[PDB]
Amino acid sequence: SVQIVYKPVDLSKVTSKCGSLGNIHHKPGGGQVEVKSEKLDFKDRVQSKIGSLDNITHVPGGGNKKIETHKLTFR
Amino acid sequence: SVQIVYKPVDLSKVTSKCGSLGNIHHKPGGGQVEVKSEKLDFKDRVQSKIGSLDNITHVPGGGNKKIETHKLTFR
Amino acid sequence: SVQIVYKPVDLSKVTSKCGSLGNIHHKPGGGQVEVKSEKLDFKDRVQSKIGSLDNITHVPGGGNKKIETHKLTFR
Amino acid sequence: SVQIVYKPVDLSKVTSKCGSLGNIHHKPGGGQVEVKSEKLDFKDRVQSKIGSLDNITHVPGGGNKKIETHKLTFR
Amino acid sequence: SVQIVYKPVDLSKVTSKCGSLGNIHHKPGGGQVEVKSEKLDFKDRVQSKIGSLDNITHVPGGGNKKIETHKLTFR
Amino acid sequence: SVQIVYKPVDLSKVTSKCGSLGNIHHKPGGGQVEVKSEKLDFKDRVQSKIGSLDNITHVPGGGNKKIETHKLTFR
């Protein structure tokens, strides 16, 4: 007789903690900002950001991926 | 007779902690910022950021990846 | 008779801690910043950042990767 | 003129991790246990535990306590 | 004129890690245990534990306590 | 004029790590244990522990205590 038992087990724990977590900002102060522009010539796309205080969190990452392949071939 | 028992076990723990975590910023102060631009000529794309205080967290990383392949071949 | 028992166990722990963690910044002070630009000619892309105080955390890293291959071949 | 500003701030972080945390027990084996009692005389309370494998975690502790008193007395 | 500014700041971090943390027990084996008791006389309380393998964690401790008193008295 | 600024800052970190942490026990083996008791007379409390393998962690300690008193008295 032939007996095949195929019972792999995945009990793993996967965690990602990505970005800004558990920080304290106590009274952050942005200074005065002055922007003076005269006679500027732009011949292509302009991306402009003007601010005093920025808090920026960008997370393209922190993804969890599992690829699993199971093959049982008999005769 | 033939008996094959195929029971691999994954009990692993995987953690990523990526970016800004558990920091304290006590009274961070940005200074005054003055930008004066005259008669500038731009022939291609402009990306400009003007600020006083920036806190920036960028996390493309911190991903968790598992690839697992299981093959059982009999005869 | 033939008995094959295939029971590898992964009980591993993996942790990544990447970026800015657990820091204290007490009264960091950015100075005054003045940028004066006249008669500049740019023939290609411009990327410009003007600030007083920057705190920047960039984390492309800190990923966890597992590749595991299991093969059992009988006859 | 009299101006009193009373603005104490509590931004503290308090954590307790008490007991059994993150341990691995891989195939712990309790042995055979035989208890044979004859002609015993007990004249007061009996507390008895008989086992082979015990895993016991007892945590009377790990409490977090804050007492804060604020008093502002004027004239 | 009189100006009083009362702004104490608690930004502290407190952590307790108490007991059994992050240990590995790999195939711990308790031996055979035999207890034979004959004609025993007990005139007061009995506390009895019989085992082969014990893992015991007892944590009365690991508590965090903060007492803070604030008094501002004017005249 | 009188100006009083009362701004003490607690940015402290306090950590306790108490007990059994990060140990590895690889195949610890308790021996055979035989206890034979005949004709014992006990006039007062009995506390008895019989085992083969014990791992015991007892932590009454590892507590964190902060006492802080603030007093500002004017005239």
Side-chain angles (χ1 to χ4, degrees):
Chain A
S1 298
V2 181
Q3 186 190 25
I4 302 185
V5 181
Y6 186 97
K7 297 185 179 181
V9 177
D10 192 347
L11 283 158
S12 62
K13 299 198 178 190
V14 180
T15 298
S16 56
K17 284 176 176 177
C18 295
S20 59
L21 304 90
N23 305 292
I24 298 165
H25 299 271
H26 180 75
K27 299 189 176 181
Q32 177 177 349
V33 180
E34 180 178 339
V35 184
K36 186 175 182 177
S37 296
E38 175 177 343
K39 292 171 176 71
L40 317 185
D41 191 5
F42 302 95
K43 291 153 180 161
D44 209 332
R45 289 146 285 173
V46 181
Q47 183 169 9
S48 178
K49 293 187 175 180
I50 304 166
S52 176
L53 192 175
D54 294 357
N55 191 292
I56 294 157
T57 298
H58 183 216
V59 186
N64 302 300
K65 188 164 188 175
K66 178 182 162 180
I67 302 174
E68 193 174 37
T69 293
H70 297 274
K71 193 171 188 174
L72 173 54
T73 297
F74 191 87
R75 301 184 74 186
Chain B
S1 294
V2 182
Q3 185 187 68
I4 302 187
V5 179
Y6 186 98
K7 308 192 187 180
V9 182
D10 190 348
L11 277 155
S12 61
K13 299 196 179 188
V14 180
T15 300
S16 57
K17 283 174 175 176
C18 295
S20 56
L21 304 90
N23 304 287
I24 301 173
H25 300 271
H26 179 84
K27 290 182 175 182
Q32 178 178 351
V33 180
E34 180 180 340
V35 182
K36 186 177 181 178
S37 296
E38 173 177 342
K39 292 172 176 72
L40 318 182
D41 188 3
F42 301 94
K43 291 155 179 164
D44 207 328
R45 287 145 283 174
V46 181
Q47 183 170 9
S48 179
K49 295 185 176 178
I50 303 166
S52 175
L53 192 176
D54 298 2
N55 192 292
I56 295 156
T57 298
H58 180 212
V59 186
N64 305 295
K65 189 169 186 180
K66 176 181 163 174
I67 305 175
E68 193 169 11
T69 294
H70 301 270
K71 187 175 179 179
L72 174 50
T73 299
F74 189 90
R75 300 181 75 175
Chain C
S1 295
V2 181
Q3 189 193 37
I4 299 180
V5 180
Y6 187 96
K7 295 189 180 183
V9 181
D10 184 2
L11 273 159
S12 61
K13 298 191 184 183
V14 179
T15 301
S16 57
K17 285 175 176 176
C18 295
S20 55
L21 303 89
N23 303 290
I24 298 171
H25 299 271
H26 178 75
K27 297 185 176 183
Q32 179 178 352
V33 178
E34 182 180 337
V35 181
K36 185 179 180 180
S37 296
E38 173 178 340
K39 292 174 176 72
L40 314 180
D41 186 4
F42 301 94
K43 293 159 181 165
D44 207 330
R45 290 145 285 172
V46 180
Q47 184 169 9
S48 179
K49 297 185 179 178
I50 303 166
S52 175
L53 190 174
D54 299 3
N55 191 291
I56 295 156
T57 299
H58 181 215
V59 187
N64 304 295
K65 189 170 182 181
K66 175 181 165 176
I67 305 174
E68 192 170 18
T69 298
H70 302 272
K71 182 181 172 184
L72 178 58
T73 303
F74 189 83
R75 300 181 73 174
Chain D
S1 301
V2 181
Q3 187 192 25
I4 302 184
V5 181
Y6 186 97
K7 299 185 179 182
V9 176
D10 190 349
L11 283 160
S12 63
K13 297 197 171 200
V14 180
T15 300
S16 56
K17 283 175 174 176
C18 294
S20 56
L21 305 91
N23 305 292
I24 296 168
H25 300 271
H26 179 75
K27 295 184 174 182
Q32 177 178 351
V33 180
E34 181 180 341
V35 183
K36 186 176 181 178
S37 295
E38 175 176 343
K39 291 171 176 71
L40 317 185
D41 190 4
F42 302 94
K43 290 153 181 161
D44 209 331
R45 289 146 285 173
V46 181
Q47 182 170 9
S48 177
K49 292 188 174 181
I50 302 167
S52 175
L53 191 176
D54 295 357
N55 192 291
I56 295 156
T57 299
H58 182 217
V59 186
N64 304 295
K65 189 167 185 178
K66 178 183 162 179
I67 304 174
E68 194 173 29
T69 292
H70 297 274
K71 193 170 189 171
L72 172 54
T73 301
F74 190 89
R75 299 182 72 169
Chain E
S1 296
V2 182
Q3 186 184 63
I4 302 186
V5 181
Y6 186 97
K7 305 189 184 174
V9 181
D10 190 348
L11 279 156
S12 61
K13 298 195 184 185
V14 181
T15 301
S16 56
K17 283 174 175 177
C18 292
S20 57
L21 296 94
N23 305 287
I24 301 177
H25 300 269
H26 179 85
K27 290 182 177 183
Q32 177 171 9
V33 179
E34 184 181 340
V35 183
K36 185 179 180 180
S37 295
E38 173 177 343
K39 292 172 176 73
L40 317 182
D41 187 6
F42 301 96
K43 290 154 180 163
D44 207 330
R45 290 143 283 179
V46 181
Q47 185 173 0
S48 179
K49 298 189 180 182
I50 304 166
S52 175
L53 190 174
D54 293 357
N55 193 290
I56 296 163
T57 297
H58 182 209
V59 187
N64 305 294
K65 189 168 183 179
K66 176 180 163 174
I67 304 171
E68 192 170 12
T69 295
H70 301 270
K71 190 174 184 176
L72 174 50
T73 303
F74 190 89
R75 299 181 71 173
Chain F
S1 295
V2 179
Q3 186 188 60
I4 299 180
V5 181
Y6 187 97
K7 293 183 178 165
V9 181
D10 184 2
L11 277 158
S12 61
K13 298 179 184 174
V14 178
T15 300
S16 57
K17 284 174 177 176
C18 296
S20 56
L21 303 89
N23 304 289
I24 300 171
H25 299 271
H26 180 81
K27 291 180 173 184
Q32 178 178 351
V33 177
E34 182 180 337
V35 180
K36 184 178 180 179
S37 296
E38 174 178 341
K39 291 173 176 73
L40 315 181
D41 185 4
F42 301 95
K43 293 157 181 164
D44 207 330
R45 290 145 285 172
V46 179
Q47 186 170 10
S48 179
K49 297 184 178 179
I50 304 166
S52 174
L53 191 176
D54 299 4
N55 192 290
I56 295 156
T57 298
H58 180 214
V59 186
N64 303 295
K65 189 170 183 181
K66 175 182 165 175
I67 306 175
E68 192 169 20
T69 297
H70 303 272
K71 184 180 176 183
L72 178 57
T73 302
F74 186 86
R75 300 183 77 181

